[PDB]
Each structure stands twice: as C-alpha cells, then as structure tokens.
Nucleic acid binder design. Structure first.
Length: 117
DNA sequence: CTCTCGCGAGAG
DNA sequence: CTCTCGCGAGAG
C-alpha cells in the first residue's frame, strides 16, 4: 500500500495515481520480464500470480476463501494490485476481470490437485 | 501447463 | 426455482 513496505520491489498499476497502485515484492528486473513477454492480460494475470504467491500458497487458497475445501483467501490487496496492473497496462473491463478471476481460481485448483499426488 | 465446460451445492 | 459460485477434469 505504501512503498516503505517493499523497497527493492515495484508498483502494481499506475505509479502516478496513489489511489490505483499497490507496492509489491517482484524486483524491477522481473517486472520488465513480465511487461515484455506477457502481451495479453490473461497471460500477465497468471504470470503475476506465480511471481506474487508461492506455489504452495496457491495450492492451499482461492480468491473468495470459501468453498467445500475451506481454502484460505489470497491477499485481497495483492489481488487488487493485479486488478490495477491489468487495468493500467491493458484497460480491461469488468467482464474481462471476471474471466481473469476464473482463470486464477482454476490455476490454484491445479496446484491443489498436484499437491495431493 | 492454460481454457473452459458442466456438475451440483447452497444463496437468494 | 433461479441464480451464483466453487469445483474436477478434459481438451488444447
């Protein structure tokens, strides 16, 4: 939320808009790897996921924190940052963000499916 | 691996 | 009953 949280990290979203920006952990070198190879909001979303949540946090959680498996909830502020970074770099819509959330939940489901094996 | 379907439980 | 939502899983 404030840059003092992560010093060597970067900003998710628009740096010059204090209301639509989140400070996160990934280093400026990884943040250029993402904005270079991820040329669609769908690929950027799931690359940001791998780089913002340790995979065994992915294998134990989902977005809302509900469900029959009783998974934990992924950080609502981190998920907000992904929402700003996709809006800022791609100008996604409310329906576009809904599809993205479905992809994120499906990615975390496969991480859960793996963990059992 | 991602994408996306459809099932079935619970909220409304 | 309709809708929302988590889910397993197959296909690409």
């Amino acid at each position: 939320n404030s840059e003092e949280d992560y010093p060597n990290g970067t900003w998710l979203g628009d740096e010059n808009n204090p209301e639509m920006r989140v400070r996160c952990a990934i280093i400026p070198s990884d943040m250029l790897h993402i904005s270079t190879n991820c040329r669609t909001a769908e690929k950027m979303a799931l690359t940001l996921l791998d780089y913002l949540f340790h995979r065994e946090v992915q294998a134990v959680s989902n977005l809302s924190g509900q469900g029959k498996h009783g998974k934990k909830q992924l950080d609502p502020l981190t998920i907000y940052g992904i929402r700003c970074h996709l809006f800022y770099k791609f100008g996604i819509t409310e329906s576009d963000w809904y599809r993205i959330k479905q992809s994120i939940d499906s990615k975390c489901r496969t991480a859960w499916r793996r963990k059992q094996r």
